[PDB]
Amino acid sequence: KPKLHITMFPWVAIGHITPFIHLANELAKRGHSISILIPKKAHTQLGHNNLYPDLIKFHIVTVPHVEGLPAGAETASDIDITAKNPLAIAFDAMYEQVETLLYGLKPDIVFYDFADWIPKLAAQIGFKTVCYNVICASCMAIGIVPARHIPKDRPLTEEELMTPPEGYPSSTVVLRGQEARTLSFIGMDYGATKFDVRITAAMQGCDAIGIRTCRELEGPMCDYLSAQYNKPVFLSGPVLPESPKGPLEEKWEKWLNKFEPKSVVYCAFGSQMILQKNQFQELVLGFEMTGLPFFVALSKPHGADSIEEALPEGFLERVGDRGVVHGGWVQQTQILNHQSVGCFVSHCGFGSMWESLLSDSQIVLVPRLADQILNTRLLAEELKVAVEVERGDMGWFSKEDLCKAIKSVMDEESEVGKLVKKNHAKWRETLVSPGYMDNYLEDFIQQLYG
Ligand SMILES: C[C@@H]1O[C@@H](OC[C@H]2O[C@@H](OCCc3ccc(O)c(O)c3)[C@H](O)[C@@H](O)[C@@H]2OC(=O)/C=C/c2ccc(O)c(O)c2)[C@H](O)[C@H](O)[C@H]1O
Ligand SMILES: O=c1ccn([C@@H]2O[C@H](COP(=O)(O)OP(=O)(O)O)[C@@H](O)[C@H]2O)c(=O)[nH]1
């Protein structure tokens, strides 16, 4: 079998481009040739991530200026929400530049997600298409699917959004109440068209749908998506990047070593979230209330000079050496692997969820976004490997709610903790079994050949 030539054209955001590159590295490792079309600024930021320079080539695509687009705006990270429709309109405008590159590259398969016009080019240039999604399967299945009717004229109510589309496999992986607002984007404008129109065209135009998940986690959701669009669904596995080697920072190791094994509660909310000052103070107070050792790695609240400035009065003093609150970036994998760490409080982002699943720590979830809430419902309610902190109307969580969730997984007495620990242990063993990740990548490649 001759090796494949795959072209990737992701939506212009670091959160989309990076998983596409990680998949490209796994494909190149197998000998396949990848051409990746991205703006230069993303190229400058992520270019070091290419581990196979002869197999993986970057092609710079220019983001055309359009009315309302800030100067030199190329990715979602450059603009805030007011520029979102200009950025999408500019993204659609690289169609002609993409067409010329595709006419030259002549790929066998093109990967895309938000560029719904790629299948039209698939007809003109002659290539197969996969609509490959970095978002979780349950979010796709509960949202933009033909079984859900989204009116063009009027927005969906909170009720319509909370109601899962007919045939949706799970009664557990659902949004509840005010959480439904987190799904409201599926109906919003996105450039010249509404988001759901763009995703519907993307899903229906492709030859197959690609999802970065595994069947053991999200199998019924993938089957629902396959039937809803009458498309095959190819599961790539999570395609997790290689763990960063190198030792843990010596001061962290020394501070962790003062504590007993599995006794330290670690907390981090990803590299995208910045908490408001009032939620931040409520969180650090919730960790103090537990009386257990804690390591909190969170960005300082926006507009705070320092972490110590943002802290509530008297916090530093009451806590002493029992807890650390650190504004800097930390080596999350190494800290979690440290014997002293016993609990992980996270927002259930994609990276943190898989790191939680693969680790030996207890799992405490404080989701914010719609996908995080759904992954939390999968982990806490269906799989029962985690506990979810109770939250308020805006996603607000009280210090007592956070404290109770931590004690419920940390106390040896707690029956809830023993159950999630046991269920967690089963799943960890499945996901770490040797060759489990590689089987998905190999099976992904074979489906591409079909
Ligand atoms: C602010 C974002 O706006 C919605 O997300 C919609 C999309 O928005 C994009 O951002 C580019 C525009 C932008 C740039 C800077 C900002 O400060 C800002 O607020 C908005 C992101 O890059 C996409 O990952 C995101 O897709 C998705 O996340 C969902 C994709 C999806 C969802 C359901 C489906 O069925 C499906 O096929 C795909 C949701 O509210 C997200 O939670 C939230 O992070
Ligand atoms: O202090 C930190 C915070 C985050 N991460 C890493 O950042 C990645 C992205 O986090 P996640 O996907 O969970 O959330 P997101 O950043 O996507 O919002 C994960 O692999 C974490 O290990 C890290 O190394 N140190």
- Tell me, letter by letter, the H, E, C secondary structure of 70-92: CCCCCCCCCCCHHHHHHHHHHHH
CATH 3.30.460.20 is right for the domain spanning 5-242+435-449: no
Distance CA 307, CA 8 (A): 40
> For residue 408, how far is its CA from the centre of ligand 2 (angstroms)?
25
Contact of 102 with 110, CB cutoff 8 Å: yes
Q: What CATH number was assigned to the domain covering residues 250-432?
A: 3.40.50.2000
Query: How far does the chain reach from its first CA to its final CA, in angstroms?
Result: 12
Q: Which method resolved this structure?
A: X-ray
Distance CA 382, CA 209 (A): 25
* Number of other residues whose CB lies within 10 A of the CB of residue 389: 21
Instruction: Compute CA distances 337 → 214, 277, 344, whole Å.
Output: 23, 30, 11
Strand-pair category, 128-133 with 109-112: parallel
- From 332, 350, 361, 372, mutation site for ligand 2 pocket: most ligand atoms within 8 A of C-beta: 332
Q: Is 401 left (phi over 0), alpha (psi -120 to 50) or beta?
A: alpha
Residue 266 carries which DSSP code? E
Crossing angle for the helix pair 399-410 and 277-290, to the nearest 10 degrees: 40
Instruction: Compute CA distances 167 → 200, 209, 227, 333, 350, whole Å.
Output: 18, 19, 10, 38, 25
Q: Which residues, at least 6 apart from 450, have a Cβ–Cβ distance to it below 8 Å?
A: none
Tokens encoding 115: 């560029």
Residue of 234, 171, 225, 163 lying closest to 199 (CA atoms):
225
Structure-token match 């404008």, residue found: 189
Q: Which residues, at least 6 apart from 321, have a Cβ–Cβ distance to it below 8 Å?
A: 255, 258
The closest ligand to the CA of 252 turns out to be 2
Q: Which residues, at least 6 apart from 349, have a Cβ–Cβ distance to it below 8 Å?
A: 269, 270, 272, 372
- For ligand 2, atom 12, name the residue with the nearest CA: 351
Please identify, by atom number, the ligand 1 atom nearest to the C-alpha of residue 202. Answer: 37
Residue 378 carries which DSSP code? I
Distance CA 180, CA 197 (A): 20
Q: Please state the separation of Cα 440 from the chain's center in Å.
A: 19
Distance CA 150, CA 253 (A): 52
Distance CA 15, CA 133 (A): 11
Strands (E), 166-322: 189-190, 193-194, 208-211, 233-235, 264-268, 294-297
Q: Which residues, at least 6 apart from 157, have a Cβ–Cβ distance to it below 8 Å?
A: none
Residue of 444, 446, 449 lying closest to 209 (CA atoms):
444
**Where do the CATH 3.40.50.2000 domains begin and end in the chain?**
5-242+435-449, 250-432
